[PDB]
Each structure stands twice: as structure tokens, then as C-alpha cells.
Amino acid sequence: FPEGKVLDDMEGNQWVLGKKIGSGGFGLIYLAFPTNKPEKDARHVVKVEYGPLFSELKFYQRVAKKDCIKKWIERKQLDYLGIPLFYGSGLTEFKGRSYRFMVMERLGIDLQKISGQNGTFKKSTVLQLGIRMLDVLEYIHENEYVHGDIKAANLLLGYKNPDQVYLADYGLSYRYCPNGNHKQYQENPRKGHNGTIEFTSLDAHKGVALSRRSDVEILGYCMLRWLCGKLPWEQNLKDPVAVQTAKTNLLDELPQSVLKWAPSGSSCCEIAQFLVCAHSLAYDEKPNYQALKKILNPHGIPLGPLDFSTKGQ
Ligand SMILES: N#CCc1ccc(Nc2nccc(Nc3cc(C4CC4)[nH]n3)n2)cc1
Numbered sequence: 001f002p003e004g005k006v007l008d009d010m011e012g013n014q015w016v017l018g019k020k021i022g023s024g025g026f027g028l029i030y031l032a033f034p035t036n037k038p039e040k041d042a043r044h045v046v047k048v049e050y051g052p053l054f055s056e057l058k059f060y061q062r063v064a065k066k067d068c069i070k071k072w073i074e075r076k077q078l079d080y081l082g083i084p085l086f087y088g089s090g091l092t093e094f095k096g097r098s099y100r101f102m103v104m105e106r107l108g109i110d111l112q113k114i115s116g117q118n119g120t121f122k123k124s125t126v127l128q129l130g131i132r133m134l135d136v137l138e139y140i141h142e143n144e145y146v147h148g149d150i151k152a153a154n155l156l157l158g159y160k161n162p163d164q165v166y167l168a169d170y171g172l173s174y175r176y177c178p179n180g181n182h183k184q185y186q187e188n189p190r191k192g193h194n195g196t197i198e199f200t201s202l203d204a205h206k207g208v209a210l211s212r213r214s215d216v217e218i219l220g221y222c223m224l225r226w227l228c229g230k231l232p233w234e235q236n237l238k239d240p241v242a243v244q245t246a247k248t249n250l251l252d253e254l255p256q257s258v259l260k261w262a263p264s265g266s267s268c269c270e271i272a273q274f275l276v277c278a279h280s281l282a283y284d285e286k287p288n289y290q291a292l293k294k295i296l297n298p299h300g301i302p303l304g305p306l307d308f309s310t311k312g313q
Pocket residue numbers: 021022023024027029045084104105106107108109110156168169170
């Protein structure tokens with residue numbers, strides 16, 4: 001697609017493209033500017049596909065409303081909420097094929113790229129990331145949505161503020177509570193073992209519709225990975241059933257399963273308690289976000305900027 005190309009979103013706003021700034025599977029990402037405001041400052045990007053983008057579109061149109069997010073932050077006294085802002089979307093012709101685009105908030109580098117020693121960050125960073133995502137999860141959950149794929153590759157540092165962290169890629173996000181109607185529990189083997197096998201919930205392994213607890217479980221597994229440097233099931237990633245039984249054994253054998261895994265110069269008291277609290281949730285139970293943030297921060301410490309320093313690694 002040529003730089004200079006003017007896109008027209010459903011709202012009738014007009015978006016001039018910049019240089020490709022990467023791509024995933026199903027996604028090309030370009031810089032973008034509105035055609036009316038200045039060009040000193042690329043605040044905006046354009047994601048393009050042509051399935052999973054539509055999931056994001058649904059997520060972002062319903063959940064990522066600026067002022068509503070503004071009302072929320074103010075009440076709960078958060079410095080910020082790790083949700084990318086959404087500006088509009090629409091279609092555009094490239095050959096004779098049509099493509100779907102979404103104009104998103106511009107953001108910095110993803111955490112996996114900037115992992116510390118192996119895939120490891122400093123404990124107090126691991127614990128703040130978990131608290132930050134607890135802020136995000138409360139918000140999306142409250143708005144009928146689960147992420148279903150929390151992991152380092154989908155945690156981005158701010159563009160404006162790098163000490164700010166943001167949860168992205170709502171391509172596996174699921175509306176668990178449409179207008180207050182919680183989904184029923186039904187195991188479906190045919191819908192079994194979607195997600196990132198390393199971090200996906202047991203509900204996900206068993207082909208259950210993702211609910212609030214699955215996100216909490218996922219965050220649990222993630223923290224464990226960012227601290228201890230790997231997971232008991234690092235071996236069995238290609239046998240998802242092996243991964244499921246591993247996860248099952250870890251949760252049925254808490255807290256020790258988790259306390260034992262930590263290297264000596266670090267602790268898993270918080271991560272262990274956190275998973276213990278996550279395991280005691282029924283399929284349709286509201287997580288106690290405030291209590292889990294205490295578990296992650298038992299000394300009621302204030303949150304510094306994120307330390308990713310890799311001095312010595
Ligand atoms: N790093 C990296 C690759 C990467 C690609 C796509 C996504 N998904 C995504 N979802 C929602 C908003 C959003 N905004 C962006 C994207 C960028 C440029 C592309 C880096 N800044 N801000 N990006 C996230 C990371």
C-alpha cells in the first residue's frame with residue numbers, strides 16, 4: 001500500500017498513512033495522521049487484515065470508549081488504564097479485494113522483545129504488571145469481555161509514556177456476559193485448546209467458553225513465567241493435553257507446586273496466593289480484583305516506573 005494513501009472511516013474521518021511499523025499473522029501496521037490536525041506527531045496507527053481483526057473491532061467499539069474510560073480512571077484513582085484508545089474503522093480497496101482497518105493509539109515496544117535474562121523480569125516489575133493488568137481486566141470484564149490471551153508479546157509500553165503498560169491484541173477476546181447473560185458451562189472438545197498453549201486457561205483446554213476466571217488463571221501463569229524464567233510444562237508445548245494435565249497438577253498441588261519453583265533470590269508467595277485465590281472461583285464468579293491486588297502487593301507499596309534494567313544479564 002503506498003504511503004500518502006487517504007482512508008475514510010465509517011465516521012467520515014480521513015486518515016493519511018505512514019511507513020509500515022511491523023506486522024503479525026493477520027495484520028499489517030502503518031503509522032497514520034488525521035488529514036486536518038498537524039503532522040509533527042504520529043499519535044495514530046492503522047491495523048489492516050481484510051476474522052481476528054473483527055473480534056478486536058467488536059471489542060474496541062463496545063469497550064474502549066474514551067470518556068467512559070475517563071469516568072473510570074477518575075473514580076478508582078488510577079494514574080491510567082492499560083487499554084489502547086480506538087479512533088474509528090472502515091473498509092478500503094487495494095486490488096479488487098476490500099480490507100478492514102482500525103485506527104488505534106500509537107504505542108511503544110512489546111515486553112517479550114525486551115525480556116531481561118531469558119524471559120525474566122525483576123519481581124517488583126512482575127508484581128506491578130500483574131496489578132496493572134488487574135486494572136485492565138476489571139474494566140473489560142465489567143464491559144462483558146475477556147481477553148483470553150494475556151502474554152508478554154501483547155503487553156506494550158506507551159508511546160507518549162513508556163512507564164505506562166497496555167494490553168493489546170483482542171483477537172481472541174470473547175463477550176462472556178452479553179447484556180448480563182453469563183454464558184452456560186459446556187465442555188466442547190471440538191473447540192478445545194485454543195489460545196497460547198503456554199498460558200491458555202484449563203477452561204480453554206476443555207473447550208469451555210472463556211469467562212472471567214480464565215483471564216485470572218492466565219495472568220497467574222504469566223507472572224510465574226516472568227519470575228522463575230519458564231514453566232513446568234516448557235517441555236510439553238506440542239502436546240496440549242500434556243500441558244492441560246500439568247496446569248491441572250499445579251493448581252491441585254498449590255501452594256507448594258508454585259513456592260518450590262521460584263529460584264532462591266526471589267519469592268512466589270504472592271503468585272502462589274494469587275493462583276490459590278484464582279482457583280477458588282466458580283465458572284461465573286466475579287473475581288475480587290481489590291483483594292488480588294493486595295495479594296500481589298502485601299506491603300501496600302506504591303508503584304514506581306517499570307524497571308526493565310538488565311544490568312549483568
Ligand atoms: N511491538 C509490536 C508489534 C505489534 C503489532 C500489533 C499490535 N496490536 C495492537 N493492538 C491495539 C493497538 C495497537 N497499537 C500500536 C501498534 C504500534 C506499533 C506497531 C508497533 N504502536 N501502537 N497495536 C501490537 C504490537
